[PDB]
Design an enzyme around this catalytic site. Structure first.
Site, PDB file in Angstrom:
ATOM      1  CG  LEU A 189      -7.084 -10.065  -4.236  1.00 43.85           C
ATOM      2  CD1 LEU A 189      -5.875  -9.162  -4.305  1.00 43.85           C
ATOM      3  CD2 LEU A 189      -7.230 -10.884  -5.527  1.00 43.85           C
ATOM      4  N   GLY A 190      -8.254 -12.438  -0.354  1.00 45.18           N
ATOM      5  CA  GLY A 190      -8.002 -13.272   0.804  1.00 45.18           C
ATOM      6  C   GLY A 190      -8.451 -12.615   2.090  1.00 45.18           C
ATOM      7  CB  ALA A 191     -10.361 -13.358   4.842  1.00 47.98           C
ATOM      8  N   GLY A 192      -7.427 -12.491   6.267  1.00 50.54           N
ATOM      9  CA  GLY A 192      -6.401 -12.812   7.233  1.00 50.54           C
ATOM     10  C   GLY A 192      -6.854 -12.563   8.653  1.00 50.54           C
ATOM     11  CD  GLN A 193      -3.326 -14.487  12.676  1.00 52.26           C
ATOM     12  OE1 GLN A 193      -2.424 -13.650  12.641  1.00 52.26           O
ATOM     13  NE2 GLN A 193      -3.218 -15.625  13.352  1.00 52.26           N
ATOM     14  CD  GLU A 196     -11.396  -8.570   6.081  1.00 54.56           C
ATOM     15  OE1 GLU A 196     -11.645  -7.354   5.937  1.00 54.56           O
ATOM     16  OE2 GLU A 196     -11.334  -9.119   7.207  1.00 54.56           O
ATOM     17  CE  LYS A 211      -2.516  -6.589   4.053  1.00 53.35           C
ATOM     18  NZ  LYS A 211      -1.300  -7.240   4.641  1.00 53.35           N
ATOM     19  CG  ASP A 302       5.397 -10.600   9.910  1.00 51.64           C
ATOM     20  OD1 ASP A 302       6.032 -11.690   9.999  1.00 51.64           O
ATOM     21  OD2 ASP A 302       4.157 -10.548   9.764  1.00 51.64           O
TER      22      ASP A 302
HETATM   23  C1  LIG Z   1      -3.478 -19.513   0.920  1.00 47.74           C
HETATM   24  N1  LIG Z   1      -2.762 -18.253   0.739  1.00 47.74           N
HETATM   25  C2  LIG Z   1      -3.286 -17.090   1.272  1.00 47.74           C
HETATM   26  O1  LIG Z   1      -4.353 -17.107   1.889  1.00 47.74           O
HETATM   27  C3  LIG Z   1      -2.518 -15.783   1.060  1.00 47.74           C
HETATM   28  C4  LIG Z   1      -1.851 -15.345   2.412  1.00 47.74           C
HETATM   29  C5  LIG Z   1      -0.712 -16.303   2.834  1.00 47.74           C
HETATM   30  C6  LIG Z   1       0.476 -16.223   1.857  1.00 47.74           C
HETATM   31  C7  LIG Z   1      -0.225 -15.971   4.253  1.00 47.74           C
HETATM   32  N2  LIG Z   1      -3.515 -14.848   0.528  1.00 47.74           N
HETATM   33  C8  LIG Z   1      -3.101 -13.432   0.380  1.00 47.74           C
HETATM   34  C9  LIG Z   1      -1.833 -13.370  -0.523  1.00 47.74           C
HETATM   35  C10 LIG Z   1      -1.397 -11.902  -0.773  1.00 47.74           C
HETATM   36  C11 LIG Z   1      -2.525 -11.095  -1.400  1.00 47.74           C
HETATM   37  N3  LIG Z   1      -2.080  -9.695  -1.485  1.00 47.74           N
HETATM   38  C12 LIG Z   1      -1.740  -8.830  -0.428  1.00 47.74           C
HETATM   39  C13 LIG Z   1      -1.370  -7.595  -0.878  1.00 47.74           C
HETATM   40  C14 LIG Z   1      -1.030  -6.541   0.030  1.00 47.74           C
HETATM   41  C15 LIG Z   1      -0.103  -6.597   1.065  1.00 47.74           C
HETATM   42  C16 LIG Z   1       0.136  -5.504   1.904  1.00 47.74           C
HETATM   43  C17 LIG Z   1      -0.577  -4.312   1.752  1.00 47.74           C
HETATM   44  O2  LIG Z   1      -0.390  -3.232   2.596  1.00 47.74           O
HETATM   45  C18 LIG Z   1       0.831  -2.724   2.934  1.00 47.74           C
HETATM   46  C19 LIG Z   1       1.012  -2.181   4.215  1.00 47.74           C
HETATM   47  C20 LIG Z   1       2.249  -1.639   4.541  1.00 47.74           C
HETATM   48  C21 LIG Z   1       3.296  -1.645   3.631  1.00 47.74           C
HETATM   49  C22 LIG Z   1       3.111  -2.177   2.359  1.00 47.74           C
HETATM   50  C23 LIG Z   1       1.888  -2.709   2.005  1.00 47.74           C
HETATM   51  C24 LIG Z   1      -1.528  -4.244   0.734  1.00 47.74           C
HETATM   52  C25 LIG Z   1      -1.745  -5.339  -0.092  1.00 47.74           C
HETATM   53  C26 LIG Z   1      -1.524  -7.649  -2.316  1.00 47.74           C
HETATM   54  C27 LIG Z   1      -1.345  -6.830  -3.448  1.00 47.74           C
HETATM   55  N4  LIG Z   1      -0.888  -5.492  -3.258  1.00 47.74           N
HETATM   56  N5  LIG Z   1      -1.565  -7.269  -4.717  1.00 47.74           N
HETATM   57  C28 LIG Z   1      -1.988  -8.579  -4.877  1.00 47.74           C
HETATM   58  N6  LIG Z   1      -2.205  -9.492  -3.903  1.00 47.74           N
HETATM   59  C29 LIG Z   1      -1.954  -8.980  -2.652  1.00 47.74           C
HETATM   60  C30 LIG Z   1      -3.766 -11.176  -0.531  1.00 47.74           C
HETATM   61  C31 LIG Z   1      -4.208 -12.619  -0.284  1.00 47.74           C
END
Ligand SMILES: CNC(=O)[C@H](CC(C)C)N[C@H]1CC[C@H](n2cc(-c3ccc(Oc4ccccc4)cc3)c3c(N)ncnc32)CC1
Length: 447
Positions: A189-193, A196, A211, A302
């Site tokens: 779904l995406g790659a971050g710092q 992923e 994640k 954050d």
């Molecule tokens: C161009 N746009 C992009 O590249 C943007 C990113 C930007 C908006 C910065 N791309 C990103 C946008 C969000 C996407 N993402 C992240 C989570 C997630 C978040 C946290 C998680 O772990 C946790 C840890 C602790 C507490 C709670 C959860 C697990 C999954 C997630 C999910 N459950 N379901 C669907 N999409 C999700 C991934 C790609």
């Protein structure tokens, strides 16, 4: 003998699950967790059952128009969802009169548009119910049938029960720390710092998000200590943490959120078109989630639109709560660049590393601005040093177009330089929940 009846349709997914025709009856054996051990009388096959699919045979939970365990605000959101009609309704447990009930009815008028009106259902001392003294009923079913025939003082004649859908299966028993092999990563779904995010399938039957943290970014013992707190932060406006893989690369398994990040949603064809009161409702939902975090003496660290997720039904859920705490600062993570964002962070957190619920309040104010500008960068036209120095001199972002003054007033309160002067999320939640109905009565005073 504790007896319950099935509400929805459910088939085997794990070792010993049972048969769930929409109206089978069973007897509860055990009640630990959201999975109950129980025996059926129909064909008498046995095993474990999901507790949220069953209901006590004599309880109101069996009725289509009864919604147990939801709030007044939940009720309004659910009734105002698309697919519901004039006079759509529910009965729910009262929030302001313990043991009594409330009727919520979808209304329309050209002045106020779509609304939900609430009525007090009072209980009679010797049995029965009424909303108005001149019309009493032996059962809530009689009450419903009565007002389905005519409004009799209500805003609308009752039409059909609020639409609802089969709830999420509760997570598998004792599957907290799971093997990495139990997950098939299907779509990145995406790659971050520092990792992923993937859409994945857990043990061939359950859609999840995963994640995947980069090696070097977290310690197993430190992460697990924190994750064991995170998993307890259960609330409709926080993303549910299901499971973890406690081996590098550490995996974090959560519910899947179909519309991704709120930041992306606001910048999408669909999200850019949400009207202002919907934006306010988003803001309210996030504030409800943060009031929970506040009540639980936790810290997000954050909070920003990128870390809010949006469900297929446009429910906002807070993600990454507490995660920054267990991302390590070392040569590995340093290779990326820029851990936390200056424009979203309270000055005392920047200057001294003092992260508290009050620095989250500051961040929430920035998030409000992100929402009402549909995802604009904070402090447009300004560098990071410029933001810090301007803030020190009492500069704050000006009110943008299409921003209610009272919403901007909440931002300005969030951005007090002294953290003790910032409001509580409990306060913010109340002002946003009642944003458009502040000078309106709680319940309708029907004659
Ligand atoms: C161009 N746009 C992009 O590249 C943007 C990113 C930007 C908006 C910065 N791309 C990103 C946008 C969000 C996407 N993402 C992240 C989570 C997630 C978040 C946290 C998680 O772990 C946790 C840890 C602790 C507490 C709670 C959860 C697990 C999954 C997630 C999910 N459950 N379901 C669907 N999409 C999700 C991934 C790609």
């Amino acid at each position: 003998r504790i007896i319950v009846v099935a509400l929805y349709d459910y088939e085997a997914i794990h070792h010993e699950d049972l048969s769930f025709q929409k109206g089978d009856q069973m007897v509860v054996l055990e009640e630990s967790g959201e999975w109950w051990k129980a025996r059926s009388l129909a064909t008498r096959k046995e095993g474990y059952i999901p507790s949220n699919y069953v209901a006590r045979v004599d309880s109101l939970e069996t009725e289509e128009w009864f919604f147990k365990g939801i709030s007044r605000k939940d009720a309004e959101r659910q009734l105002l969802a698309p697919g519901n009609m004039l006079g759509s309704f529910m009965i729910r447990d009262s929030e302001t009169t313990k043991g009594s009930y409330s009727l919520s009815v979808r209304d329309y008028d050209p002045r106020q548009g779509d609304t939900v009106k609430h009525y007090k259902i009072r209980t009679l001392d010797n049995g029965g119910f009424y909303i108005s003294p001149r019309s009493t009923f032996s059962t809530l079913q009689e009450l419903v049938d009565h007002y389905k025939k005519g409004n009799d003082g209500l805003c609308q004649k009752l039409s059909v029960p609020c639409m609802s859908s089969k709830p999420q299966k509760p997570w598998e028993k004792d599957a907290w720390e799971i093997p990495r092999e139990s997950l098939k990563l299907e779509k990145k779904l995406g790659a971050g710092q520092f990792g992923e995010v993937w859409m994945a399938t857990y043990n061939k039957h359950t859609k999840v998000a995963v994640k995947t943290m980069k090696p070097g970014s977290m310690s197993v013992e430190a992460f697990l200590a924190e994750a064991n707190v995170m998993k307890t932060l259960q609330h409709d406006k926080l993303v549910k943490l299901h499971a973890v893989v406690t081996k590098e690369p550490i995996y974090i398994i959560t519910e899947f959120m179909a519309k991704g990040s709120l930041l992306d949603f606001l910048k999408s064809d669909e999200g850019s078109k949400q009207p202002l009161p919907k934006l306010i409702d988003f803001s309210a939902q996030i504030a409800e989630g943060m009031a929970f975090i506040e009540q639980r003496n936790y810290i997000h660290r954050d909070l920003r639109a990128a870390n809010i997720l949006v469900s297929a039904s446009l429910v906002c859920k807070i993600a990454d709560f507490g995660l920054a705490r267990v991302i390590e600062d070392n040569e590995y993570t340093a290779r990326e660049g820029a851990k936390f964002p200056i424009k979203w962070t309270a000055p005392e957190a920047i200057n001294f590393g003092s992260f508290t619920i009050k620095s989250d309040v500051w961040s929430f104010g920035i998030l409000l601005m992100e929402i009402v500008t549909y995802g604009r960068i904070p402090y447009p036209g300004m560098s990071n040093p410029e933001v810090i120095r301007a803030l020190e001199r009492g500069y704050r972002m000006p009110r943008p177009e299409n921003c209610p003054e009272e919403l901007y007033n909440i931002m300005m309160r969030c951005w007090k330089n002294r953290p003790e002067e910032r409001p509580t999320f409990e306060y913010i939640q109340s002002v946003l929940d009642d944003f458009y109905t502040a000078t309106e009565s709680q319940y309708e005073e029907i004659p």
